[PDB]
């Protein structure tokens, strides 16, 4: 099976800048390499067919270069409207095969998160449970470390963390750190704090509440 | 204008069987080879099967061959995919797609997608809990303990669109849980009523939870 290898895996670049995605085949393919664009929640959109042939409707800033085994997809200038995942596909031999995909990120200006904390809801306590949630909104870069300290003490179990994809408007990320724990173990404690470590700032940003 | 609308995805027990179907239109169906390509988050896009415009020729990648049977009814302009002896690694979103060729080539047209979750876990509605406070205030909703995916989430029935962040769900065993947050001006709350609406189509569970100040 002609094996294709695509890289980089994920690439961060600033608006206007150039983007060069590269795909290499396990054998010669001449130019039976096709490129695809896929925005979040949508299906893949055809962008370039064999022979580095830019499919109709596709902006000219897109271009496919390559023949034989080295192929290249580029963007003379990154626009907010190109944040997608790209896949290359060799259509020269069976089975058809796609690349690992490249994921584009809009490198923007650093920004600190706006941490928000919430103590469990009445009805949740009822069912005999407690979930402390912590919302860290509109930050960048995506790397960040959230920690849960109950009464100054550490804790790493029952922590569910989720990140949103990069916001299509302000290019920021937001993540949800939500600690779970028995209504019993919640009751017999007081200090509940959500501590976030991020590049944006030095000292950890700390939000908390008691009782 | 070409259109491929597949339907059939579902929660199937491991080892079960399922039958997806694709409804083509906007083009002369029996003049193109058709295909199913599936996509998983960790393995990306992966070709699953193809069938010539005359249905005489089929092509399957080893990993699926013997299990999946792609067919087509040129009369109804429909493309099928009968799946048997399903496995967990079969869980994924399946796309219906067209080749600009009569046998096989690249993929020019894609469908909308249909998801197939191969699991043992039982369906089960969510427990929605409001996240009230305790500048501009920020409220949240916490959907928890449901399966399978997906679960739709809106604020004030979609009327509240700005400031909404719905974080991806995560598996905690065989039960997903997700949350959404909304920020509204300090004045519009609690003077105004902010509601959260959760819908778990799988278990025909709809829910409107109002966010009242604790
Ligand atoms: Ba070819």
Residues A126 and A180 in one domain: yes
Q: How many helices (H) does chain B have, and how many strands (E)?
A: 0, 18
A92 and A41 Cβ atoms separated by less than 8 Å: no
A88 and A102 Cβ atoms separated by less than 8 Å: no
Q: After which residues is chain B broken (C to N over 2.5 A)?
A: 134
Token code pair at residue A64: 């496919």
Query: Which residues 80-139 of B are in CB contact (within 8 Å) with A?
Result: 95, 100, 104-113, 127, 129-134, 138
- CA nearest A115 in B: which residue? B138
Q: Residue A167 belongs to what domain range? A: 108-211
Comparing CB atoms, the residue among B106, B134, B167 nearest residue A164 is B167
Burial of B106 (0-12, 13-18, 19+ CB in 10 A): buried
Contact state of A133 with B130 under an 8 Å Cβ cutoff: no
Q: β-strands A33-38, A19-25: how paired?
A: unpaired
**DSSP code of residue A18:** -
Query: E strands along B125-175, which residues?
Result: 127-131, 138-146, 152-155, 165-171
DSSP-derived 3-state class of residue B16: coil
Residues A119 and A188 in one domain: yes
Comparing CB atoms, the residue among B44, B129, B140 nearest residue A135 is B140
Residues A49 and A94 in one domain: yes
CATH topology of domain B1-120: Immunoglobulin-like (2.60.40)
Contact state of B127 with A87 under an 8 Å Cβ cutoff: no
Neighbours of B49 (CB within 10 A): 22
Q: Point out the domain boundary residue: A72, A91, A107.
A: A107
Q: Point out the domain boundary residue: A72, A107, A142.
A: A107
Side-chain half-sphere CA neighbours of B194 within 13 A = 30
CA–CA gap between residue B58 and residue B214 (Å, rounded): 62
| A149 beta partners | A193
Residues A96 and A117 in one domain: no
CA dihedral angle for residue A67, residue A70, residue A75, residue A76, rounded to 10 degrees: -80
* CATH number of the B121-212 domain: 2.60.40.10
Residues A116 and A85 in one domain: no
B126 and B119 Cβ atoms separated by less than 8 Å: no
Partner B contacted by A26 (CB < 8 A)? no
Residues A186 and A146 in one domain: yes
Q: What distance separates the 2 farthest-apart alpha carbons in chain A? A: 69
Residues A34 and A83 in one domain: yes
Neighbours of B18 (CB within 10 A): 18
Residues A44 and A116 in one domain: no
Burial of A30 (0-12, 13-18, 19+ CB in 10 A): middle
Residues A66 and A84 in one domain: yes
Contact state of B181 with A175 under an 8 Å Cβ cutoff: no
CA dihedral angle for residue B92, residue A39, residue A28, residue B59, rounded to 10 degrees: 30
Q: β-strands B11-12, B114-118: how paired?
A: parallel
Neighbours of B142 (CB within 10 A): 26
Residues A81 and A167 in one domain: no
Query: E strands along B26-123, which residues?
Result: 34-40, 44-51, 58-59, 68-73, 78-84, 92-99, 107-110, 114-118
For B18, B29, B75, B76, B78, the CA distances from B24, given in Å and listed in that order, are 20, 7, 11, 9, 6
| B94 beta partners | B38, B114
Residue linked to tokens 């399946």: B94
**DSSP code of residue B62:** T
CA of A32 to the centre of ligand 1 (A): 6
| B158 beta partners | none
Token code pair at residue A107: 């490198």
Token code pair at residue B133: 């406070």
Burial of B207 (0-12, 13-18, 19+ CB in 10 A): middle
Q: Which of A74, A55, A71, A78 is nearest to A63 (CA)?
A: A74
CA–CA gap between residue A158 and residue A155 (Å, rounded): 9
Partner B contacted by A37 (CB < 8 A)? no
Report the residue count for chain A. 211
Q: Which of B132, B138, B177 is nearest to A161 (CA)?
A: B177
CA–CA gap between residue A47 and residue A38 (Å, rounded): 10
Burial of B56 (0-12, 13-18, 19+ CB in 10 A): exposed
Residues A97 and A127 in one domain: no
**Solved using:** X-ray
CATH number, domain containing residue A64? 2.60.40.10
A86 and A98 Cβ atoms separated by less than 8 Å: no
Neighbours of B2 (CB within 10 A): 13
B49 and B34 Cβ atoms separated by less than 8 Å: no
């Amino acid at each position: 099976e002609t094996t294709v290898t695509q890289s980089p895996a994920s690439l961060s670049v600033a608006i206007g800048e150039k983007v060069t995605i590269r795909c290499i085949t396990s054998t010669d393919i001449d130019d039976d390499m096709n490129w695809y664009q896929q925005k979040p929640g949508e299906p893949p959109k055809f962008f370039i067919s064999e022979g580095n042939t830019l499919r109709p409707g596709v902006p000219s800033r897109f271009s496919s270069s390559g023949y034989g085994t080295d192929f290249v997809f580029t963007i003379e200038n990154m626009l907010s409207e190109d944040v997608a995942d790209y896949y290359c596909l060799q259509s020269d031999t069976l089975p058809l095969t796609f690349g690992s995909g490249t994921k584009l990120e809009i490198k923007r200006a650093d920004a600190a998160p706006t941490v928000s904390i919430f103590p469990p809801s009445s009805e949740q306590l009822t069912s005999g449970g407690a979930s402390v949630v912590c919302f860290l909104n509109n930050f960048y870069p995506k790397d960040i470390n959230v920690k849960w300290k109950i009464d100054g003490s550490e804790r790493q179990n029952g922590v569910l963390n989720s990140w949103t994809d990069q916001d299509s408007k302000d290019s920021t990320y937001s993540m949800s750190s939500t600690l779970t724990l028995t209504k019993d173990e919640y009751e017999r404690h007081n200090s509940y704090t959500c501590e976030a470590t991020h590049k944006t700032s030095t000292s950890p940003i700390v939000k908390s509440f008691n009782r | 204008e070409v259109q491929l609308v597949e339907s059939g995805g579902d929660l199937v027990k491991p080892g079960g069987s399922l039958k997806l179907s694709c409804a083509a239109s906007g083009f002369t169906f029996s003049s193109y080879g058709m295909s199913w390509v599936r996509q998983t988050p960790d393995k990306g896009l992966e070709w699953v099967a193809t069938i010539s415009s005359g249905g005489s020729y089929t092509y399957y990648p080893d990993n699926v061959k013997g299990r999946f049977t792609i067919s087509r009814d040129n009369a109804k302009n429909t493309l099928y995919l009968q799946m048997s002896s399903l496995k967990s690694e079969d869980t994924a979103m399946y796309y219906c797609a067209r080749h600009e060729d009569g046998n096989w080539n690249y993929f020019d047209y894609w469908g909308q997608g249909t998801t197939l979750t191969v699991s043992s876990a039982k369906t089960t509605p969510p427990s929605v809990y409001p996240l009230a406070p305790g500048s501009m205030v920020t409220l949240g909703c916490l959907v928890k303990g449901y399966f399978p995916e997906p679960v739709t989430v809106t604020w004030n029935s979609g009327s509240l669109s700005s400031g909404v962040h719905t974080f991806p769900a995560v598996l905690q065993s065989d039960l997903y849980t997700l949350s959404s947050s909304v920020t509204v001006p300090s004045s519009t709350w609690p003077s105004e009523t902010v509601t959260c609406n959760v819908a778990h189509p799988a278990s025909s569970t709809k829910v409107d939870k109002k966010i009242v100040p604790r």
